[PDB]
Symmetry: C3
Subunit: 108 residues, 3 copies
């Protein structure tokens, strides 16, 4: 599932930058894909009765770590300081050749 509730916590699946309706990427850019990832994540969090501010942990998996800065600049707009606990690294590849995938854990 996209999200699972356990007690105080909610666990979200790794989110790709897809249009919720179509299942296709919003574009090829890491910028649009990142933005879309954060938007989708917001939708899923709020559906679970959480929100951006109740997120306690995130993991950002990147296709290219060189995008780190711009990704971050987008990320910071959704998770401003104080931001959740975070880990970031470059993977060999992501599903559907995505540019970015973000997973997270939040409180209820």
């Amino acid at each position: 599932s996209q999200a699972i509730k356990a007690n105080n916590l909610v666990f979200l699946s790794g989110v790709l930058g897809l249009i919720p309706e179509t299942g296709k990427f919003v574009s090829e850019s890491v910028e649009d894909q990142t933005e879309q990832v954060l938007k989708n994540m917001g939708e899923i969090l709020k559906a679970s009765g959480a929100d951006y501010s109740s997120v306690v942990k995130t993991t950002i998996m990147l296709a290219d770590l060189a995008d780190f800065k711009t990704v971050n600049e987008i990320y910071a707009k959704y998770f401003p300081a104080p931001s959740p606990a975070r880990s970031t690294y470059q993977v060999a590849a992501l599903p559907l050749n995505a540019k970015i995938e973000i997973e997270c854990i939040a409180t209820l």
Copy 2:
């Protein structure tokens, strides 16, 4: 340790496709190794007083995302929909040159 209990949760280590008693891979194949990972994982879960059905989050680390389609269909037999929250990506390499590693978090 293979699993650590904390309140309502149990955290499992990343699991490779090894025959538990011998420490060796079931084969050099992703199919066999995935199936084995899921078996071992099951036994650890039930040893902790959990089970496949109480798993809230999983992470699948692959050596090759071409296997992702096969892996999925094996995975689906152990985690039928609605399945746990999940993240999947391809790493540079796994311990002991494994084809697949899976970690998870479950409820007690």
Copy 3:
């Protein structure tokens, strides 16, 4: 943030082997960086009201899996058996070209 508290749990950000005050790597060695990661990690756990012995889950992201052995040696000194649940893999790259990143979850 470096650590987020949620009920019985605390979530730590991925930790690099940096001199905390200066933000610069302790060295370019994986050995020194591993040791430093673990120390910093201890600081962040203690400042949060937790400790090494209350850590329930770790994730070790390596730049080169050949370092595994020595890393695990160093790691073993900070998390002696019985040690936390753990996943380990090699990533394509880490932030600031680090040799090792370690994230963790502990109890309060």
